[PDB]
Amino acid sequence: DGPEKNYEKTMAILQIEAEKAELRLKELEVRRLMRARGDGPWYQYPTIDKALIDHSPKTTPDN
């Protein structure tokens, strides 16, 4: 075939790989920040559910 086919195929491939590399760097940074802080959906370790607490008079005023 002609050179334009290989030229444009290489251009598309280069775009795909560059986007993938940038996405991988962003993923690593996001993971590091998320584990360090814990304010995102990832790395949310469970805590005690508050629906288990009994809110009723307890035979003693001071709980």
Select the residue interacting with another protein from 12, 14, 23, 28 (CB under 8 A).
Answer: 23
The set of residues, in sequence order, having a beta carbon less than 8 Å from that of 33 and lying 6+ positions away, is 40
Measure the CA–CA gap between 54 and 31, rounded to whole angstroms. Answer: 38
Nearer to another protein, 3 or 61 (CB): 61
Q: In the bound complex, what is the minimum distance in angstroms from residue 60's beta carbon to another protein?
A: 14
Under rule CB under 8 A, residue 44 binds another protein: yes
Alpha carbon dihedral 14, 17, 18, 22, in 10-degree steps, equals 170
**Binding region for another protein (CB under 8 A):** 16, 19-20, 23-24, 39-41, 44
